[PDB]
Structures are given as structure tokens and as C-alpha cells.
């Protein structure tokens, strides 16, 4: 066994090794291994992406106008976010400016995704780490009603309703066909909600599974379908016609009425179901404000997102702030430049890829995606991994760093960046939220904090949906209908050689697509995706990524039941298809 020091952690692979493969209730394929000491405390954590498809390779030789459709298929969970990054990147390379309505609609698409992706994560993915579903069977329906009504004005709270939900769960379980609940961690000492709260949460899990389907109707109006809506380089394809012949063939007042109806319902659900549930999880699980800190008190990164001035990606335009903090120095939020070769670099010395020199990091404009499955000395064989060898190559995920620093990205990262840039709304919201839980600010920098920030962001995004919709309606009232710029649609109008960067904040964090065009075709296309940052393997200095750091130092009650590991990993909302692409 070996031991070394990095980022204030002691990485020690002595002691019992635990393996969790597959990681479930994530998107895609992940393996996690840890070592635990004699006190059942994690002294080593190993994050492994167990899939690869090679979109960066597939994109070579494609028409830049087609790229968004290919890269959208990086992920069907954060569906649309790669298409947005792609059209931004191609427009940046070619020198295309889109009309205001196109930008507004794109912002709507992204805010819709944030609302949907965050809501479903909270209930369908992370929910069962916090809610003991089987324990809901012991709840008193009247006490459940009283609890729900004490937390929220949400209408659906009658004793009869909770009794009906409980009875349906009873009948579901009674025949022994437990489906998704089979062989779960129910009864684990870390489940701390009373039975009434478990029934309330389970009822809401079902309500959210039903309701999420409605949110994406906004993507269907503007983008044709969800998952995987359509886009164009130059704007959006959803031509608008309000008051002219043929409005039946376009985005018209009836289509806009539908969108408005969805926005209102989405805000209602997030504000009155998700938000109180998140705060309730906080109230009953305060020790988790001190677990899973990882890099969140050291290094956090946001590119920023939601440009409110069309075609302006500067600080004054982006509604969601960008910046970087390193070395725990939150008094100095640093500017980020995605073209600077000394800023974003990816290392592969611990990943399954070939570089000419694996001891150096490559900026994505110099990126290489040459897969090389080489696990070295596992316990087992090349096709039977019993234990990954984290001293060599152990993942399909590349290792991104910012100025050589390992960074956390995502809702907690963004919240910290906005807070410390002095965003008045963020400061007010965060302060009020931590006050309600009687926790210090530092309590946000934790597994519990990731979940709270995600809920906060869903609420923020639902509000922004109305803001963007009102912006769109204002343009229409002023007779501004344009949704596409086609001046540079034809390849004959393009520079022979150009490159561009498209960036945004996907639900899970900082997303960038770097594209180089030559002779009308994609010459290079490199993606660095939020889960690539968070699920990163180690670098040449042995520095650990966000997941590995968040797992470090964690006490497990029952080693063979990895509930604490799942809680912390799920708090980041891992998307492994995104991470590996």
C-alpha cells in the first residue's frame, strides 16, 4: 500500500477495499472504489468512468451546421445543452450573430432544461438516499397531512390522499414484486426522517415523476420534441407568425399561450413542492452540512451562462455569473478565459488515452482523443477488473484542471461564485436559506449544500423562464419577429480556417465545446463537460478531483451498504455519458 498528501488530504490505500459497480441512479456507467480504515472511514476514493463512445472522433469531417445534432446525443438527460454549446461554438468560429428572439428562445430552452433536470434529479435520482420508502408504510396519514400543511401551501395534502398513496405502496409491495425498491438500503441508520416525512416525500416523488413530463412541452414548442430538440446555426428554426396568414404553420399566439401555461405550472411545482422538501431534508439531516465538502471550500469554477444581451458573452450580459476561486480564497474571484492555453487543460496520465507526453496537460484547441484501454495491474484481468489500479490509468474520463488546479463545478460552485462576487439576490437567498436551517454559511459547502443549491437553482430558473418569455413577448409587441440570421449560412461565406468556443452552465456545471473549422468541415472538436471536471481521475501531481475529494474522510456505518457514498456522489448529479462523450 502507499500513502501520499494532496490538497490537505492523506490518500492511503491500505485497509479494506470496497467496490461499487454499477453506480445506479446516475446517468450512464460509473465504478467507484474506496479504501476504509479500522474506523470505517474512507482514506482513499477512486472515481472511474466505465463507458466511452468517442463523439470528438465522430465529429471530425462533419458540416459545422450539423454538429449540434451529433453532440446533442452526448446526453439525453441534459438534453439540449450540448446543442446550445455547439451552435455557440460554430457561431463564434464563423462570426455569426443571431437575432434577439433566437437568443431569448435559447435562454428559454436552457432554463427549461435546468428546471426539468434539477427537479427529476432531486426526486428520481437522489430522493431515495434521503427518503426511506419502505418506512412510509408506517406513517400516520393524518400526521403526514399535518406535516405537509406546516411546510407548504401546496394543495395536495389531505389525509385521504396520503392514505391512498400509502395504500398503493402497500399493495405494490405486498406481492413481493418490489421493482425499483428491491434490496435497497431501507432501515440504514443514516435514514433520519420520521415516517410521516417519508410518506410525504414518497407522495412527492410520484407527483414529480408525473409532472416533469409537462415541463418539456416548452422544448416541444420551440424545438419540436424532447428529448433531443432541434436547433440551427444562426438562431432557431421555430419561425414566428402572430398576425399574418399562415400563422397556423408557425409559432403563433396559441403556441405562446401553451408555453406560458407551462411556465406558471413549473414555477408553482418547484416553489411549493421541491423547495419545501429540500429545506425539510436539510432540517432532518444537518450533520450532512459537514460531510462531503471536498473541493467546495478550496476550488470552484463557473464559466457563466444566460447571455441577456444577444451575442454578448461578457460579464455584463451573462445572468449567471462566471469566475474561479482557488486555494480557498473566496475574497478573490478570478476571471476565466477559455482561449488561454494556460487555463483549461486536460491530463490523461490516469486515463485510458494516448498523448505524446502524458505528463503535460493539453488545452482543448490542442486536444487529442486517442482511446487506449490499458488498466495495467488490476486484481483480475483486462476483462475482469476486481480492483482498479489508481496508481496508473483507471478511467475513460479525462482530467481537466484550471491553471493546474482541480476544481468543483455545478450548482454549489455557481452559488459560491455568485455569492462572493456580491450578487445581491444570491447573497440574500443563501443567507436566508442557511438562517432557516440555523447553520453557518460554511454548511453550504457539503453534500447537503449541493442539494440545497440545486433546489435554489430550480427556483431561480423557473423565475427566469417568465423573465425570458416576457422579453420575447415585448419584442413581438414591437414587431420584432426575427428568429434566424442566414447571412453566413452558406459555406462559401465562411473563413477557410477558423476556430471558436461555445460555453454555458449546464445543470451539472461548466460546459465548453472547442471547434476548429477548415475548408467547410470540422477539423477538431473537443468537449470538456461538467462531470468530466467533477468525476476526474488524478493528474501528474496526484491531485484528486471533486468526487474523490468529497468522498475522502467519510465515515460509513455499514461498509457493505454504501449509502454515504451514494449520497455524496448523487449530490453532484453524475452524468457519465457527458463525462466521457
Amino acid at each position: 500500500s502507499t500513502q501520499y498528501e494532496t490538497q490537505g488530504y492523506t490518500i492511503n490505500n491500505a485497509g479494506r477495499r470496497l467496490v461499487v459497480d454499477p453506480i445506479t441512479r446516475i446517468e450512464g456507467h460509473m465504478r467507484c472504489e474506496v479504501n476504509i480504515n479500522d474506523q470505517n472511514v474512507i482514506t482513499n476514493a477512486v472515481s472511474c468512468g466505465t463507458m466511452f463512445r468517442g463523439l470528438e472522433i465522430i465529429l471530425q469531417g462533419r458540416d459545422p451546421r450539423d454538429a449540434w445534432a451529433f453532440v446533442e446525443r452526448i446526453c439525453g438527460v441534459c438534453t439540449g445543452v450540448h446543442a446550445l454549446a455547439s451552435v455557440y461554438a460554430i457561431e463564434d468560429a464563423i462570426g455569426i450573430k443571431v437575432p434577439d428572439n433566437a437568443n431569448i428562445i435559447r435562454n428559454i430552452m436552457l432554463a427549461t432544461l435546468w428546471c426539468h433536470d434539477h427537479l427529476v434529479h432531486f426526486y428520481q435520482l437522489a430522493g431515495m438516499d434521503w427518503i426511506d420508502v419502505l418506512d412510509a408504510l408506517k406513517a400516520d396519514p393524518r400526521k403526514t397531512s399535518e406535516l405537509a400543511q406546516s411546510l407548504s401551501s401546496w394543495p395536495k395534502s389531505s389525509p385521504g390522499y396520503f392514505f391512498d398513496v400509502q395504500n398503493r405502496l402497500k399493495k405494490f409491495v405486498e406481492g413481493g414484486q418490489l421493482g425499483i425498491f428491491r434490496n435497497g438500503y431501507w432501515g440504514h441508520p443514516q435514514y433520519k426522517l420520521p415516517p410521516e416525512a417519508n410518506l410525504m416525500g414518497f407522495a412527492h416523488y410520484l407527483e414529480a415523476l408525473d409532472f416533469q413530463r409537462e415541463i418539456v412541452k416548452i422544448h416541444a414548442v420551440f424545438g419540436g420534441k424532447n428529448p433531443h430538440p432541434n436547433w440551427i446555426v444562426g438562431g432557431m428554426p421555430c419561425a414566428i407568425n402572430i398576425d399574418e396568414s399562415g400563422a397556423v404553420g408557425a409559432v403563433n399566439m396559441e403556441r405562446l399561450n401553451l408555453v406560458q401555461s407551462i411556465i406558471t405550472r413549473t414555477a408553482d411545482f418547484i416553489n411549493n413542492v421541491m423547495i419545501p422538501d429540500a429545506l425539510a431534508i436539510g432540517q432532518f439531516n444537518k450533520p450532512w452540512s459537514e460531510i462531503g465538502t471536498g473541493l467546495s471550500d478550496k476550488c470552484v469554477l463557473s464559466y457563466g451562462a444566460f447571455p441577456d444581451i444577444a451575442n454578448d458573452f461578457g460579464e455584463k450580459s451573462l445572468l449567471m455569473p462566471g469566475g474561479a476561486v482557488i486555494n480557498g480564497d473566496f475574497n478573490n474571484v478570478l476571471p476565466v478565459d477559455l482561449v488561454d492555453p494556460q487555463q483549461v487543460q486536460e491530463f490523461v496520465d490516469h486515463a485510458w488515452y494516448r498523448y505524446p507526453n502524458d505528463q503535460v496537460g493539453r488545452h482543448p484547441f490542442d486536444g487529442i482523443t486517442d482511446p487506449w484501454y490499458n488498466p495495467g495491474d488490476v486484481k483480475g484481468s483486462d476483462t475482469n477488473i476486481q480492483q482498479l489500479n489508481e496508481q496508473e490509468r483507471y478511467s475513460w474520463i479525462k482530467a481537466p484542471r484550471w491553471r493546474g488546479n482541480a476544481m468543483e463545478v455545478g450548482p454549489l460552485a455557481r452559488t459560491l461564485i455568485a455569492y462572493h462576487k456580491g450578487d445581491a439576490a444570491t447573497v440574500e437567498s443563501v443567507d436566508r436559506m442557511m438562517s432557516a436551517l440555523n447553520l453557518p454559511l460554511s454548511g453550504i459547502q457539503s453534500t447537503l449544500g449541493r442539494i440545497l443549491c440545486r433546489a435554489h437553482e430550480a427556483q431561480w430558473a423557473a423565475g427566469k423562464l417568465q423573465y425570458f418569455f416576457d422579453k420575447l413577448m415585448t419584442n413581438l409587441k414591437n414587431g420584432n419577429l426575427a428568429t434566424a440570421s442566414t447571412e453566413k449560412w452558406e459555406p462559401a461565406t465562411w473563413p477557410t480556417e477558423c476556430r471558436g468556443v461555445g460555453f454555458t452552465e449546464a445543470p451539472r456545471g461548466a460546459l465548453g465545446h472547442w471547434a476548429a473549422i477548415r475548408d467547410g468541415k470540422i477539423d477538431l472538436y473537443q468537449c470538456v463537460v461538467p462531470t468530466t471536471w467533477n468525476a476526474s481521475p488524478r493528474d501528474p501531481k496526484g491531485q484528486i478531483g471533486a468526487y474523490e475529494a468529497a468522498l475522502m474522510n467519510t465515515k460509513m456505518a455499514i461498509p457493505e451498504q454504501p449509502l454515504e457514498i451514494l449520497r455524496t456522489l448523487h449530490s453532484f448529479d453524475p452524468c457519465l455519458a457527458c463525462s466521457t462523450h
Partner: protein, 268 residues
């Protein structure tokens, strides 16, 4: 009464098919899971992880050997000894073969499982291979699309539960009910196609009147799916209705049929 056991596994995929499934408007995915089937294994939704998840998989395929439906999303890569997709430390293809062996029938959800989809597009770095090229001794129903329509997925499920039989299929294994006709055979813009009324560039006067998208590269004329009739997301829209031509996403090899914006070459 007991519900039919369903094991849902995932190879190389983006998860769009699982996401489409939960968009179902009728029956709601909630009601499918609670009342119509027993979804006994599913990496994206199940409580159990790691060894607990392995135990569920093993127990279900053993106890219900010959009696469960296998749902597959994504596909096996043959490159790097199958280690482009790793499950429980071993090639995904081993899990696929074990699950397929005990299944009564297999549902290949989406273009990935049916044909290959994006990872199989040129140059196919991982040698991603559709299910029917690996599993050759089992009924496989192909339900292609990237992803398939939510209410088509749930209709196919309810058909099988209600009628206690597999749907009748075309020569490619696609259900006739939803894949028997072309997008272009039921497209509400066909009047414009026939009149030679075409969008020529984005957001032109033609686009604002909902003219035909053929000259913008619509692949509707060569694509079989239900999008132009059943539509998407509780009948709200479909690609063409919202102004973009069909990409051809339900058809084998659609990524490598030239640019999405190049016109269909030979209209059948």
C-alpha cells in the same frame, strides 16, 4: 395479479430512450411501473447499487428464467475486448448475453439498440454493434428513433400487456402499428410539397407560413415513424411542426447519409 417481470439494461447510450419513456402521457410512466409491469432492474431508477444491484439482477434472471422481458437501451462495443463499456468490472456484452439468455423476448429501444445510432456513426471508434447482431436466438422487437416517441413506447408496452403478445413487425422487426408508414406519408406540410412551396432559407416568408422543409434537407420522405401523426410530448409538436426538417433519426445509418441540410436524393 402478478405483473410481468421486466429487466431493463443499458449499454453505450445517452439515456434519451429512458427519458422518453418517463415522458409518457398515457399511461403515465408512474402507472406503467406501479400497475402494468414489474420493472425489476433498471440502473437509472433502482435503489440498489453495486453488489446489491448485482444481487437483484442475478435473483431476477434466475427466479424468472424464461419469463421476463428484456428491455435494452444502448449497444455493446466490440472494441478493446468490449471494455469501452464496463459493468461490474466486465464487458457489458457479457451482461447483455446473460440477460438475453433467460428472456422470453427482447425490446430494443431506440436507434442505439436497433441499429447503432451516434456512436456507430463514421468512424465508429468503439465498434458499437446493434443488439440483433449479438443476440441471434431471441425475438427482438426494434423500436427505433432517437429517442422513440414517449407515447409510442408506452403504447407498445400496453399492447404487449393487454394482448399478451408481441406486436406484428415489418421485415426489419419494427412494429407495424407505428412504423408502417413514412413521416412524409402523414405530414401536414405535404400540401406545400405537392405545390412546390418550400422554405428556402431559415425564417423566410415561406418558413413563417409553415411551408415544406424538403429543400432544407427534411428526411421525412425516407423515414418510417409516427411523428407526423402521434406527434411528441402529449401531441404538442414534432420536428417539422417546429420548423426543422426530419433528421431521419428512426432509420439505420441516418448520421452518415450526408448533411442533415442536404436534400433527399431519391424520393421513393
Amino acid at each position: 395479479k402478478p405483473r410481468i417481470p421486466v429487466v431493463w439494461i443499458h449499454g453505450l447510450e445517452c439515456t434519451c430512450c429512458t427519458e422518453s419513456f418517463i415522458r409518457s402521457a398515457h399511461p403515465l410512466a408512474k402507472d406503467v411501473i406501479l400497475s402494468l409491469i414489474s420493472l425489476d432492474y433498471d440502473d437509472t431508477l433502482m435503489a440498489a447499487a453495486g453488489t446489491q444491484a448485482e444481487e437483484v439482477f442475478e435473483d431476477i434472471i434466475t427466479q424468472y428464467n424464461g419469463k421476463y422481458i428484456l428491455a435494452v437501451e444502448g449497444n455493446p462495443p466490440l472494441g478493446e475486448q468490449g471494455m469501452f463499456c464496463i459493468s461490474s468490472g466486465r464487458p457489458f456484452i457479457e451482461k447483455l448475453k446473460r440477460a438475453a439468455a433467460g428472456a422470453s423476448a427482447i425490446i430494443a429501444w431506440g436507434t442505439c439498440a436497433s441499429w447503432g445510432c451516434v456512436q456507430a456513426a463514421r468512424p465508429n471508434p468503439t465498434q458499437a454493434t446493434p443488439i440483433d447482431k449479438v443476440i441471434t436466438d431471441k425475438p427482438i422487437i426494434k423500436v427505433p428513433g432517437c429517442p422513440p416517441i414517449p407515447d409510442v413506447m408506452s403504447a407498445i408496452i400496453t399492447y404487449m400487456v393487454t394482448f399478451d403478445r408481441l406486436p406484428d413487425v415489418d421485415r426489419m422487426g419494427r412494429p407495424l402499428m407505428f412504423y408502417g408508414q413514412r413521416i412524409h406519408d402523414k405530414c401536414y406540410r405535404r400540401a406545400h410539397f405537392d405545390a412546390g412551396e418550400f422554405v428556402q432559407s431559415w425564417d423566410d416568408d415561406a418558413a413563417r407560413k409553415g411551408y415544406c422543409l424538403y429543400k432544407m434537407g427534411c428526411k421525412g420522405p425516407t423515414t418510417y415513424n409516427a411523428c407526423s401523426s402521434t406527434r411528441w410530448n402529449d401531441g404538442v409538436s414534432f420536428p417539422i411542426q417546429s420548423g426543422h426538417g426530419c433528421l431521419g433519426c428512426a432509420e439505420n445509418g441516418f448520421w452518415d447519409r450526408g448533411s442533415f441540410y442536404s436534400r433527399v436524393v431519391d424520393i421513393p
